[PDB]
Amino acid sequence: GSAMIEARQVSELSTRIISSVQMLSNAQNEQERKEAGRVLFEQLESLLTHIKELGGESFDSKLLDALESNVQNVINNLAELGVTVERKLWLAKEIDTRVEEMRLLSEELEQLTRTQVQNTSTIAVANVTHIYDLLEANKKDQVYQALDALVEVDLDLTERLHELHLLAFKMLNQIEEARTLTNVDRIQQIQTAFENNLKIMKRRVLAVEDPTRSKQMSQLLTELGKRQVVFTILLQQYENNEQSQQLMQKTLELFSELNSTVNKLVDDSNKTT
Amino acid sequence: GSAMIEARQVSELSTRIISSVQMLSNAQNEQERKEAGRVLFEQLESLLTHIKELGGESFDSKLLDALESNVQNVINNLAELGVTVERKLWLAKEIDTRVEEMRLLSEELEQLTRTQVQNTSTIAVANVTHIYDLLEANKKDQVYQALDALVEVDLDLTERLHELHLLAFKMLNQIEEARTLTNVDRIQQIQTAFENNLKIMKRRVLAVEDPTRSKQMSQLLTELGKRQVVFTILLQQYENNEQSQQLMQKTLELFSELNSTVNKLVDDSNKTT
Amino acid sequence: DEKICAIYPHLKDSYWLSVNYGMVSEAEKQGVNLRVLEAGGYPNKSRQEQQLALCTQWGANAIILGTVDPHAYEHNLKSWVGNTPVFATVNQLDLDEEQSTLLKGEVGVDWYWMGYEAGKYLAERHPKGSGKTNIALLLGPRTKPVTTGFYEAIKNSDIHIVDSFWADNDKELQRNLVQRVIDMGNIDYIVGSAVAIEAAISELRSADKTHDIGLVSVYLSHGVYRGLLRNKVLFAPTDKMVQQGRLSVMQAAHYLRHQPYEKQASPIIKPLTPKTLHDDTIEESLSPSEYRPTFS
Amino acid sequence: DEKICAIYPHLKDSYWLSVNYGMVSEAEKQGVNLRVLEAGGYPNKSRQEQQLALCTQWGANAIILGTVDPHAYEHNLKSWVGNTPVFATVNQLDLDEEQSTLLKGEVGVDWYWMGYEAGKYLAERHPKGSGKTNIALLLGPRTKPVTTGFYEAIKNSDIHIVDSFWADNDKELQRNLVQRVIDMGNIDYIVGSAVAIEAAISELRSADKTHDIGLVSVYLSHGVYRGLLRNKVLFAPTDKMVQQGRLSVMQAAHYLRHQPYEKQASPIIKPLTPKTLHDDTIEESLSPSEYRPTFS
C-alpha cells in the first residue's frame, strides 16, 4: 500500500548515494572529504528512516531480516570506504614529507661528491705546477716520480670520483621521481634499483681515502638507507587506491542486494489488504 | 498498473550498467574493452525495451519527452565514455612506442659520451708516458710544453667531458621516468627540463673539437629534439584519464535523473484507471 | 687546546682550498683545535645555519665565519651561536649592534681594489693617446666592488670595454662566454674571474688565438698562477688567501688566550705578472702542491 | 679509392684505440677510403647489425668486422651486408658454409697463448719445489682461452691459485676485487686483465703494498705499458694490436686490388718485461702518444 511511497524513496535515494561515494573517492584535500561525505552522511540518515518506515510494513520474519542485514552492510561498506579516503589523504601527505627529507639528504651527498671532483681537479693543476719547478732545477729523478704520482693518483682519482659523483647523481634522480610515482611496477623497480645503487655506493666511499669526507658520505648513506621505507609506503599508496575502488564496486552490489529485498517487501505488503 | 513491474526492471538494469561501465574504464588490453564493452551493449538493449514499455504506460506529453531525453543522455554518455576508453589504450600504445624510440637514442648518446670520457683517459696516460721519454733524453724544453698540453688540454677536456656526460646521463633518466608519467605537474616539469637540457647540450657538443663525434651527437640530439612531442601526448594521456573520470561521474548523475523520471511516470499511471 | 670552529660558504674553489690551508696550518702552529665545516655552496643559506648551530653543540670556544650572505645572521647569530665569539673571514659579515656583541675580529680584503689593480695594469699598458684598445669583461654572476673598482682604474686611458657578459662562476658557463668573445674577434683582452680566465687559457689554445687575446685575471687561483708562471696570463692580483686564513685563526687564538691582535686584519693586495712571482707572496696566497682539504 | 668500412665492438678500450690507429694509419698508406663504426659495446648486438647494413648502404667495397659475438651473423651476414667481401678482425667470426662465402680474410691471435705466455713467465721464475708461491686471478668476465692457457703453463709449477675473482672488465668493478685481494694478504702476485692490473698499480700504491704483490697482466695497454716502463708491472704479453689493424686493412685492400696476401694473418705474440720493451715491438702494439680516435 503506502509501502510504495517509502520504497520509491529508498530506490531513489540509493542512486543519489552511489553518486555520493564516487564524489567521496575523487575527494582530495580534507575539504572535499568533510563535504562530499558530510552530504553522504545525510543522504544516509534519510535512507535509514525511510528504511525504518518500510521496516514496519511487513512481518515476514525472513524478509525483515534480509532488510536489516542489507542495510548494515551498506553502512559498513560506506563506513569502510570513508576510512580508505581518510587514509589516502594521509598517505599522500606522508609520502611528500618523507620524500622531501631524502631530497635534502641525497642533494647534500651529490653536492659533496661534486665538491671532491672539484677539489681533485684543482689539486691536479697544483701538482703539475710543482713539476715545472723540479723540471727546471734539473731534479730529474723527482720530476718523473711526480709524473708517476700524477698518473697513479691524480688521474686515477679523477676518474674514480667522476664515477662516485655520477652514482650519487643517479640516486638523487631516483628520489625526485619517487614522490609523483604511482605505477606499481615502476615503484618496484626504483625500489630495488635504489637499494642496490646504495649498497654499491656504500663500499665505493668506504674505499675512497679522505677521512672527513668518507665519514660524512657514510653517515649520509646510512641515513638515506633508513628513509628507504618511503618505497614501502609508496606501495601502501597504490594499494590503498585499489581498495577504494573495490569498495566502490562493492557499494553497487550491496545497494542492488538491498533494493531487491525492499521490493519483495513492497509486495507481500499488498497481500491481504 | 503494470508500470512498477517494468520500472523494477529499469532501476535494476541501471545498477548493472553502472557496474559494467566502471568495468569498462578499468579495461586495458582490447579484451577487457571488447568484453566488458560487449556485455554493456546487451544490458543497454534490455534497458531500452523496458524503457520503451513505460512509453506506453503514460500519455503526459511533458513526462514523455523528459524520459526520451534522459535515455538519450545515458546512451550518449555511455557512448562518449566508450570512445574515451579506446582512446586511452591508443595513447598507452603510442607513448610506449614513441618513448622506447627515444630511450634507444638517448642511450646511444650516453654511451657515445662515455666512450669519449674513456678515450680521453687513456690518451692522457699515453701523453704522460711520452713525457718520460722526453724528460730522460734531456729535451727539457719539450717537457714543460707537454706539461702545458697536459693541463691546458688533457685535464681540461677530462672535466669538460665529465660534464657533457653527466648532461647526457640526466637526459636519459628523464626519458626512463617519462614512459610511466601520469602527474600533470611533473610531466610539464620534466618536459621543460628536457627541453632546456637539449638546448644547453646542443651547444656544448658543437664546442667539443672532434669532427666525427661532434657530428654524431648533434644528429643524435636533433633526433631527440623531434621526438619531444611525446610529452605533449603524455599530457593528452592525462587529459583523457580526467575525462573518463568526469564521464563516469556524469553517468551516475544521469542514471539518477532517469530513475526520478521513470518514477514520476509510475504515477500519472495511477490517475484515471 | 681551545676549540675553534670554521664555517665556509663552500670549499670547491682554488680560493677557499687556500683559505683552508691557512687555517689548518695556523691552527696547528697556534696549538688550537680546529674543526671546519662548509655549507653546500652560496645558496645553502639553511645548511650554514644548521652548521652554525652545530658548531655550538660541539662546544666551540670561538667561531670563524665565512657568510653565505652578508645580511644573514644580521639579526640572528646569537640565535644560532648563542653568544660564542665570532670572527668574520674573507666575506663581509654585517650585523646590527645587538648582534655585533659577538664580532671579535674581521679578516678580508675590499674587493674594489682587486678590480682596481687589474684595471690599473691595463690603464698603464695603454695610456691615453697610445691607441684605442678593446676589452671584454667576464667578471661573473649578475655595482659589485670588483666592477666599480675596475671602472675607476680604467677611467681615462684609451682602454675601451667592447662588451661585458655575466653568468655564474661555473667553469662550463664561463667557457661558453669566452667562446662567444672569441667569435666576435675585435677584442684584445679578456678581463675576468679566475675561473673564466682559466677557461680562456684552454679556449684560446684550441682556437689558436694565443698571442691574439691577452688575459687579465681579477683574482688568483692555482691555474691562473700556473698561467702567469707559464706566460699564458698577463696579470692578476692577490689577496693572499692563505694569509687571510692564518689571520682569522690567529685572531681567534689570541682573543681567547688574551693576547694582542688586529681587530680588523687585511693583507696587502699584491700585483702579479709572469716576471714577478715572488715566492713569499704566493706562499701567502695558494695552498701547497700536495695539500688536500683538511677539516681538523 | 676503394671504400673499406670497418666495424668495431666498441672503441673505449686502450686496445681498440690501437687497432684503430693501425687501420687508419695503414688505410692511408694503402690509399683506401676508410670509414669506421663502433657499436656501443659487446651487449649492443642489434646496434652492430644496423651498422653492418649502414656500411652496405654507404656502398663499401669491403667490410672489416670485429664481431660483438662469435655466433651472430653466423646464419645472417649476407642478410645485412648482402654479399660485400667481409674480413674478420681481432675477434673470431664463425659462420656456416652458406655464409662463409664472404669471408675473404682473418686477422687475430689465439688468446690461449696470451694467457700461456703470462703463465710461462711465473712458472719459470717459480719452478716446482723451489718454494710455494700464491697467486690471485682477476681475468674478468664469467673455460675461456686466456684461462685455460694460463692454467697449462702453470700446470705443475709450485704456483698456487689462492682464489679467482670474475667481474666485467670495468675499472671500478675490478678495483673492488683488487682491493678484496689486498685484504686476504697471502697473495704474492695478481695475474689479470689490463684494466685489473692498471687498477692494482694505483690500489697497491695507496696501501703501500708495492713490493709485496707483483703484477702480471694478461694483455697490453697504455697504462700497463707505462707500468712496465716504470717498473710497476712485472710482465705483459702483446698480440700487437696496431699491427692486427694494419693487417686487416692490408688484406681488404689487396683482395680488391687482386693482389697476394695471407688469408689468415696472425701477428706473433711478444712477451714484455720492464727491461725488454723494444721500440719496434710496442710500435706495432699501442697507438702513438697523441693519436685520437679517427673514423675516416
Side-chain angles (χ1 to χ4, degrees):
Chain A
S2 168
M4 182 191 119
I5 317 171
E6 233 55 11
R8 247 174 87 302
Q9 264 293 185
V10 170
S11 191
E12 202 287 309
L13 263 182
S14 296
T15 311
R16 289 167 49 198
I17 296 295
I18 296 166
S19 199
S20 304
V21 302
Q22 189 70 65
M23 283 288 310
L24 182 62
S25 296
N26 296 309
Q28 42 184 43
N29 58 182
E30 192 54 57
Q31 285 306 67
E32 295 170 45
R33 195 284 280 285
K34 279 283 66 187
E35 181 58 53
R38 179 236 60 185
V39 322
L40 184 53
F41 166 75
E42 303 202 301
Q43 293 182 66
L44 189 75
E45 281 291 57
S46 299
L47 183 72
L48 283 163
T49 57
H50 281 287
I51 214 88
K52 236 41 278 176
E53 286 308 305
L54 175 61
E57 291 295 56
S58 180
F59 296 107
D60 175 47
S61 187
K62 193 192 74 176
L63 232 72
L64 235 158
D65 277 46
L67 180 63
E68 169 185 344
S69 182
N70 288 174
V71 179
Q72 202 51 240
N73 300 308
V74 155
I75 304 181
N76 285 8
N77 197 74
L78 266 44
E80 168 159 45
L81 192 150
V83 176
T84 287
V85 178
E86 119 100 45
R87 200 162 188 292
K88 189 251 289 185
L89 246 58
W90 184 89
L91 275 182
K93 209 83 76 68
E94 186 73 343
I95 290 178
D96 282 33
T97 294
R98 193 165 326 209
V99 147
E100 233 278 0
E101 208 169 5
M102 294 175 85
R103 216 212 62 262
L104 287 180
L105 282 179
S106 186
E107 176 175 294
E108 178 169 356
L109 215 214
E110 181 283 324
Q111 303 176 341
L112 195 68
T113 55
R114 181 172 279 154
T115 307
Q116 301 196 66
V117 184
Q118 296 287 297
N119 294 322
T120 287
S121 287
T122 84
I123 299 180
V125 183
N127 284 21
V128 171
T129 299
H130 183 271
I131 299 188
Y132 287 121
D133 296 354
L134 309 170
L135 186 277
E136 207 215 55
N138 311 288
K139 289 177 174 292
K140 172 106 71 161
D141 259 302
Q142 306 163 63
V143 169
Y144 65 24
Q145 181 59 66
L147 286 183
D148 292 1
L150 201 66
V151 181
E152 280 153 29
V153 184
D154 297 288
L155 271 191
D156 185 58
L157 210 146
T158 232
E159 292 306 333
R160 202 168 157 184
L161 285 275
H162 174 337
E163 280 302 307
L164 192 66
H165 175 238
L166 212 293
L167 189 52
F169 187 77
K170 182 32 165 281
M171 182 158 296
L172 179 52
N173 283 185
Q174 318 196 84
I175 292 181
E176 300 173 6
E177 159 173 26
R179 56 177 305 85
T180 57
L181 263 189
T182 85
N183 180 304
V184 62
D185 287 285
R186 180 61 171 173
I187 306 174
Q188 298 282 187
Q189 187 181 189
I190 299 302
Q191 180 182 57
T192 64
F194 188 89
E195 180 180 62
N196 222 85
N197 195 290
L198 187 103
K199 251 106 284 294
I200 148 185
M201 174 136 63
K202 278 183 175 196
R203 220 182 310 89
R204 300 270 189 292
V205 300
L206 267 200
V208 168
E209 200 154 0
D210 194 315
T212 326
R213 303 293 188 44
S214 178
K215 162 89 99 73
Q216 302 181 56
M217 298 196 285
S218 288
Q219 282 168 180
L220 278 174
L221 280 174
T222 65
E223 268 310 305
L224 284 180
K226 289 177 172 168
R227 288 46 161 32
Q228 220 171 311
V229 304
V230 74
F231 286 115
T232 283
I233 127 179
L234 220 302
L235 284 221
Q236 302 182 331
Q237 165 91 152
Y238 169 74
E239 193 49 53
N240 171 280
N241 272 284
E242 273 296 66
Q243 219 50 55
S244 91
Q245 212 177 64
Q246 288 184 300
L247 270 52
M248 213 91 92
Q249 193 60 62
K250 196 60 61 183
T251 292
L252 298 193
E253 303 167 12
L254 302 181
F255 267 132
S256 183
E257 188 53 67
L258 176 69
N259 283 77
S260 165
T261 281
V262 319
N263 275 328
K264 301 186 192 63
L265 204 75
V266 177
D267 310 321
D268 296 299
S269 169
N270 295 318
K271 296 299 176 183
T272 300
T273 313
Chain B
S2 178
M4 182 186 97
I5 315 160
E6 224 74 10
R8 246 90 157 304
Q9 291 279 199
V10 166
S11 178
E12 209 309 302
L13 273 162
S14 290
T15 295
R16 273 154 59 190
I17 299 289
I18 302 170
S19 176
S20 301
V21 299
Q22 214 147 54
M23 240 275 289
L24 186 70
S25 279
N26 302 321
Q28 50 191 53
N29 59 179
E30 197 55 54
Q31 280 307 64
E32 303 175 59
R33 195 288 270 289
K34 251 293 74 190
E35 175 47 41
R38 183 220 73 180
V39 301
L40 183 59
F41 177 59
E42 283 181 286
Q43 295 173 59
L44 197 70
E45 284 296 51
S46 298
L47 172 57
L48 287 178
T49 62
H50 293 297
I51 237 71
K52 229 63 264 188
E53 285 312 312
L54 272 50
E57 295 298 65
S58 179
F59 297 103
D60 169 30
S61 201
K62 218 206 72 176
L63 221 67
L64 259 165
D65 293 57
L67 179 71
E68 180 184 356
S69 196
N70 292 172
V71 181
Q72 201 42 262
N73 302 322
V74 170
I75 297 177
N76 286 338
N77 196 68
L78 272 27
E80 183 165 59
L81 181 144
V83 161
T84 280
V85 169
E86 77 179 308
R87 188 162 203 289
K88 175 209 194 180
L89 276 40
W90 188 83
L91 293 177
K93 222 45 57 71
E94 190 69 10
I95 288 181
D96 277 51
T97 284
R98 188 180 303 258
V99 162
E100 231 271 351
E101 206 174 9
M102 287 175 97
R103 201 198 90 273
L104 284 187
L105 293 182
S106 176
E107 181 184 287
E108 180 167 357
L109 220 208
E110 193 277 318
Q111 305 174 339
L112 187 57
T113 54
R114 171 169 286 150
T115 297
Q116 302 185 61
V117 172
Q118 295 189 276
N119 289 332
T120 301
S121 271
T122 85
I123 270 52
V125 174
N127 293 327
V128 168
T129 299
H130 180 252
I131 293 181
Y132 291 120
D133 290 357
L134 291 184
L135 187 272
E136 206 231 50
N138 304 298
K139 290 176 173 270
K140 160 116 75 160
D141 285 313
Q142 302 176 62
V143 172
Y144 42 26
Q145 187 59 67
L147 290 171
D148 305 10
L150 206 62
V151 175
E152 280 152 36
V153 195
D154 280 292
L155 291 174
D156 183 63
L157 202 157
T158 284
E159 300 305 332
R160 200 166 146 174
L161 281 284
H162 175 330
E163 290 294 306
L164 187 61
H165 173 239
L166 217 322
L167 204 39
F169 186 68
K170 180 41 165 278
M171 174 161 301
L172 175 59
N173 292 179
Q174 321 197 76
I175 294 184
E176 296 182 7
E177 156 169 44
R179 53 87 38 53
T180 41
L181 275 173
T182 58
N183 177 296
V184 67
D185 282 288
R186 182 165 200 51
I187 305 178
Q188 299 187 175
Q189 183 182 175
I190 296 301
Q191 175 186 62
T192 78
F194 184 92
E195 178 174 59
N196 285 43
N197 220 296
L198 212 66
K199 253 86 291 302
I200 190 166
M201 182 146 25
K202 285 191 183 190
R203 204 183 318 101
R204 301 261 195 286
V205 287
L206 289 195
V208 182
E209 187 191 2
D210 189 321
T212 310
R213 307 294 194 45
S214 181
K215 170 114 116 70
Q216 296 179 59
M217 304 205 282
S218 289
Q219 286 168 180
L220 278 188
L221 281 171
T222 56
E223 266 303 286
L224 282 183
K226 292 174 181 173
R227 287 47 163 34
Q228 210 162 330
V229 296
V230 69
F231 288 117
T232 280
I233 122 170
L234 229 339
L235 267 276
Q236 305 184 331
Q237 161 122 96
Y238 170 75
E239 221 44 70
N240 177 266
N241 294 313
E242 287 299 75
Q243 235 52 53
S244 69
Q245 190 171 68
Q246 301 178 299
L247 266 46
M248 178 79 65
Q249 180 69 60
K250 189 54 58 185
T251 291
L252 305 178
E253 302 170 358
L254 278 178
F255 259 133
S256 212
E257 171 73 66
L258 178 71
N259 266 53
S260 139
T261 286
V262 317
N263 278 351
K264 297 192 193 70
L265 211 81
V266 170
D267 303 329
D268 289 284
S269 170
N270 303 309
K271 321 283 187 177
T272 296
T273 307
Chain C
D1 292 294
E2 310 88 313
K3 294 207 291 185
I4 296 173
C5 203
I7 305 175
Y8 311 163
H10 69 262
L11 174 22
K12 28 177 90 289
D13 233 27
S14 180
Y15 196 82
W16 290 89
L17 191 255
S18 288
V19 179
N20 192 232
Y21 178 77
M23 302 194 189
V24 185
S25 171
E26 194 60 25
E28 195 257 4
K29 297 202 300 80
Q30 208 71 49
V32 301
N33 182 50
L34 181 60
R35 197 273 270 270
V36 316
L37 306 175
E38 51 93 45
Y42 281 112
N44 292 27
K45 314 305 177 67
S46 181
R47 187 93 68 60
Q48 197 174 64
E49 301 187 312
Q50 317 178 329
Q51 296 189 302
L52 222 38
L54 201 168
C55 273
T56 309
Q57 292 166 51
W58 176 57
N61 295 307
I63 295 191
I64 297 183
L65 199 244
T67 13
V68 87
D69 178 294
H71 307 296
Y73 322 119
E74 167 168 77
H75 298 313
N76 315 38
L77 202 64
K78 298 185 88 167
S79 53
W80 306 105
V81 303
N83 68 322
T84 316
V86 297
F87 306 63
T89 341
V90 183
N91 305 166
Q92 173 70 296
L93 167 70
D94 34 63
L95 29 73
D96 66 43
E97 65 316 292
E98 179 201 5
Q99 238 60 67
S100 73
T101 303
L102 316 183
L103 226 325
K104 303 306 180 180
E106 296 172 77
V107 174
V109 184
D110 189 329
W111 265 47
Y112 165 89
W113 301 100
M114 273 296 140
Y116 180 93
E117 199 64 54
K120 194 219 280 175
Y121 166 90
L122 279 178
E124 308 183 310
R125 174 100 131 68
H126 299 289
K128 242 302 177 189
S130 61
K132 207 274 281 279
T133 300
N134 306 312
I135 261 49
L137 285 175
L138 258 38
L139 304 181
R142 302 179 21 56
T143 181
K144 169 178 273 183
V146 196
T147 315
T148 67
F150 181 74
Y151 275 76
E152 259 295 299
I154 291 311
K155 225 298 299 173
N156 150 61
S157 68
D158 265 49
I159 271 183
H160 177 208
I161 297 173
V162 165
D163 212 312
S164 176
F165 310 97
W166 295 281
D168 281 65
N169 243 47
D170 161 38
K171 229 285 186 51
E172 232 36 58
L173 299 182
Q174 286 308 316
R175 170 178 285 114
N176 189 234
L177 319 190
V178 176
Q179 271 160 181
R180 194 206 301 304
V181 175
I182 297 180
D183 297 319
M184 56 175 59
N186 272 299
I187 283 68
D188 306 277
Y189 297 76
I190 291 179
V191 168
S193 58
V195 54
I197 260 58
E198 278 180 42
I201 292 191
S202 307
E203 226 48 45
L204 277 192
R205 172 204 258 265
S206 62
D208 231 308
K209 302 292 169 53
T210 299
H211 304 312
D212 288 40
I213 313 174
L215 305 174
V216 187
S217 192
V218 141
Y219 68 90
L220 197 69
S221 75
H222 317 74
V224 157
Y225 168 67
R226 134 86 186 36
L228 296 167
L229 183 66
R230 297 293 313 162
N231 280 93
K232 293 299 208 303
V233 179
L234 280 168
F235 167 91
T238 271
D239 49 358
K240 338 267 262 297
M241 299 83 77
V242 173
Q243 185 162 69
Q244 295 191 225
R246 292 177 181 292
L247 300 182
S248 277
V249 159
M250 301 169 143
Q251 293 185 307
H254 291 193
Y255 170 88
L256 301 176
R257 298 181 196 291
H258 295 289
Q259 289 181 291
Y261 77 83
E262 279 196 61
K263 259 97 71 59
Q264 305 191 311
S266 168
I268 343 160
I269 298 179
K270 230 68 177 304
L272 300 161
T273 52
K275 320 184 65 56
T276 58
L277 304 183
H278 305 311
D279 293 53
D280 58 308
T281 274
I282 75 86
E283 313 299 313
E284 293 172 46
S285 306
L286 299 174
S287 67
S289 58
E290 276 302 13
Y291 184 68
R292 206 75 52 173
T294 300
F295 304 76
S296 58
Chain D
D1 300 300
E2 303 81 322
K3 291 197 300 187
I4 304 161
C5 200
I7 302 177
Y8 308 168
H10 69 261
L11 179 38
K12 42 172 84 286
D13 216 352
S14 178
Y15 193 94
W16 284 92
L17 190 271
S18 308
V19 177
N20 183 238
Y21 175 71
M23 295 195 191
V24 183
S25 179
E26 192 63 17
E28 194 269 354
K29 306 210 298 71
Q30 201 67 51
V32 295
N33 183 39
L34 191 52
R35 211 288 268 297
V36 317
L37 299 182
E38 47 85 55
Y42 287 107
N44 292 25
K45 321 292 178 55
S46 196
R47 179 93 60 64
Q48 196 175 52
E49 299 195 302
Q50 306 169 297
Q51 285 175 147
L52 240 6
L54 187 146
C55 269
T56 310
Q57 265 158 54
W58 179 59
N61 296 307
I63 299 174
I64 301 181
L65 174 280
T67 351
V68 81
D69 174 291
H71 310 299
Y73 315 128
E74 186 181 300
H75 297 301
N76 313 39
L77 201 57
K78 301 192 71 163
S79 53
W80 308 101
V81 299
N83 60 315
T84 305
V86 304
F87 303 69
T89 345
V90 197
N91 298 159
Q92 171 81 293
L93 172 66
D94 16 66
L95 24 64
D96 78 319
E97 62 314 298
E98 184 184 7
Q99 240 59 60
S100 46
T101 307
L102 331 181
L103 211 293
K104 311 302 185 181
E106 303 177 80
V107 172
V109 183
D110 185 343
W111 273 53
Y112 169 81
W113 293 108
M114 286 270 84
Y116 182 95
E117 209 60 40
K120 175 188 291 166
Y121 172 86
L122 287 184
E124 303 192 313
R125 239 162 58 58
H126 290 280
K128 225 242 191 168
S130 64
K132 257 280 304 287
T133 298
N134 303 298
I135 256 57
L137 278 185
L138 282 50
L139 303 183
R142 306 171 27 59
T143 185
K144 173 188 285 181
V146 191
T147 328
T148 81
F150 178 77
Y151 273 97
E152 261 287 310
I154 291 305
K155 216 299 298 175
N156 159 65
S157 76
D158 245 49
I159 269 171
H160 182 209
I161 306 178
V162 173
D163 215 310
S164 167
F165 312 94
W166 292 292
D168 281 68
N169 247 27
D170 181 70
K171 230 272 179 47
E172 230 42 49
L173 297 191
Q174 291 296 319
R175 176 186 273 101
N176 192 235
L177 306 181
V178 171
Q179 285 170 172
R180 216 213 294 290
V181 173
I182 302 182
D183 293 319
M184 58 173 70
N186 251 308
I187 295 63
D188 298 274
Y189 301 78
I190 298 177
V191 172
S193 61
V195 46
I197 261 57
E198 285 177 37
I201 292 185
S202 288
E203 233 34 43
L204 286 182
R205 174 193 249 279
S206 40
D208 197 71
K209 291 292 181 57
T210 292
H211 301 313
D212 286 46
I213 302 181
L215 298 182
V216 170
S217 176
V218 152
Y219 67 90
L220 189 70
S221 65
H222 302 80
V224 160
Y225 163 67
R226 121 83 185 37
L228 289 167
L229 183 65
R230 301 285 313 150
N231 289 77
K232 295 293 200 307
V233 169
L234 281 184
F235 171 87
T238 306
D239 56 355
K240 309 266 231 307
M241 299 78 76
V242 166
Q243 184 166 67
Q244 305 199 207
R246 291 180 186 293
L247 292 174
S248 277
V249 163
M250 288 180 169
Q251 296 187 320
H254 287 187
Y255 169 91
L256 300 182
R257 303 177 195 298
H258 288 287
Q259 295 161 292
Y261 71 86
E262 276 180 41
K263 285 101 55 62
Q264 297 193 299
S266 171
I268 298 166
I269 290 175
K270 247 53 199 292
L272 297 170
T273 55
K275 297 154 85 76
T276 59
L277 309 183
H278 302 312
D279 293 61
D280 69 305
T281 274
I282 78 84
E283 302 316 316
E284 308 170 48
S285 307
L286 301 162
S287 84
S289 74
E290 276 301 16
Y291 186 66
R292 195 83 47 175
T294 297
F295 308 74
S296 62

